[PDB]
Amino acid sequence: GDDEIENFRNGTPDKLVSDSLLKLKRLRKERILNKVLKPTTEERELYFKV
Amino acid sequence: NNVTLKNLTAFQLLSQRENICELLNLVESTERHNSIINPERQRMSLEEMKKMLDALKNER
Amino acid sequence: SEKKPIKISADFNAKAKSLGLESKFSNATKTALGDPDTEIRI
């Protein structure tokens, strides 16, 4: 995606990685609070991006 | 309405701490001290005493 | 800050709280593992 190209050209990709990991953790917490096992598509996409 | 060891110890410790904090003047208890004295109630009671005394005076 | 930092009143639940002893009048504390929802989730 374009976010990666920007956060590479403008330096600091680590900020993108940290924000994406926070989003992954939040999504997993929401996935635990209601009983569901299969991760959604956006979680797979964030994992692949990281 | 029930009294257990925890309640008793908490009550005693609260009383002690309140007294000590009052010694160091670290507490302002104007609300409590004026709800207990209640100067309005003082005036009411004084006027009631005066009326009762007048009643006893005039019955003779 | 400048004046007396306590200001005791005639409530005994704010009075007790302002002097530290707040949970010390309840039987047992409040925890998270006591609800059936969290139990079902675990």
Swiss-Prot record, chain A:
Protein localization: Nucleus
Q: What job does the chain carry out?
A: Component of the chromatin structure-remodeling complex (RSC), which is involved in transcription regulation and nucleosome positioning. RSC is responsible for the transfer of a histone octamer from a nucleosome core particle to naked DNA. The reaction requires ATP and involves an activated RSC-nucleosome intermediate. Remodeling reaction also involves DNA translocation, DNA twist and conformational change.
Misc: Present with 4460 molecules/cell in log phase SD medium.
- Kindly state the subunit structure of this protein: Component of the two forms of the RSC complex composed of at least either RSC1 or RSC2, and ARP7, ARP9, LDB7, NPL6, RSC3, RSC30, RSC4, RSC58, RSC6, RSC8, RSC9, SFH1, STH1, HTL1 and probably RTT102. The complexes interact with histone and histone variant components of centromeric chromatin.
* Name of the protein in question: Chromatin structure-remodeling complex protein RSC58
Taxonomic source organism: Saccharomyces cerevisiae (strain ATCC 204508 / S288c) (Baker's yeast)
Swiss-Prot record, chain B:
| Superkingdom classification of source | Eukaryota
Record keywords: Acetylation, Cell cycle, Nucleus, Transcription, Transcription regulation
Membrane spanning residue stretches: none
Tell me where the signal peptide lies. none
Any miscellaneous information on file?
Answer: Present with 3550 molecules/cell in log phase SD medium.
Query: Tell me, what does this protein do in biology?
Result: Required for cell cycle progression through G2/M transition at temperatures higher than 33 degrees Celsius. Component of the chromatin structure-remodeling complex (RSC), which is involved in transcription regulation and nucleosome positioning. RSC is responsible for the transfer of a histone octamer from a nucleosome core particle to naked DNA. The reaction requires ATP and involves an activated RSC-nucleosome intermediate. Remodeling reaction also involves DNA translocation, DNA twist and conformational change.
Complex and partners: Interacts directly with RSC8. Component of the two forms of the RSC complex composed of at least either RSC1 or RSC2, and ARP7, ARP9, LDB7, NPL6, RSC3, RSC30, RSC4, RSC58, RSC6, RSC8, RSC9, SFH1, STH1, HTL1 and probably RTT102. The complexes interact with histone and histone variant components of centromeric chromatin. Component of a fungal-specific module (HTL1-LDB7-NPL6-RSC3-RSC30) within the RSC complex.
Q: What's the protein name? A: High temperature lethal protein 1
Gene name? HTL1
UniProtKB/Swiss-Prot annotation, chain C:
Q: Which gene encodes it?
A: STH1
Q: Which organism is it from?
A: Saccharomyces cerevisiae (strain ATCC 204508 / S288c) (Baker's yeast)
Q: Where does it reside?
A: Nucleus
- Top-level taxon of origin: Eukaryota
Kindly state the subunit structure of this protein.
Interacts directly with SFH1, CSE4, histones H3, H4 and H2B, and via its N-terminus, with RSC8. Interacts with LDB7, NPL6 and RTT102. Component of the two forms of the RSC complex composed of at least either RSC1 or RSC2, and ARP7, ARP9, LDB7, NPL6, RSC3, RSC30, RSC4, RSC58, RSC6, RSC8, RSC9, SFH1, STH1, HTL1 and probably RTT102. The complexes interact with histone and histone variant components of centromeric chromatin.
Q: What else is known?
A: Present with 1990 molecules/cell in log phase SD medium.
The family line of this record is: Belongs to the SNF2/RAD54 helicase family.
Organism lineage reads as: Eukaryota, Fungi, Dikarya, Ascomycota, Saccharomycotina
- State the function annotated in the UniProt record: Catalytic component of the chromatin structure-remodeling complex (RSC), which is involved in transcription regulation and nucleosome positioning. RSC is responsible for the transfer of a histone octamer from a nucleosome core particle to naked DNA. The reaction requires ATP and involves an activated RSC-nucleosome intermediate. Remodeling reaction also involves DNA translocation, DNA twist and conformational change.
Protein name per its UniProtKB record: Nuclear protein STH1/NPS1
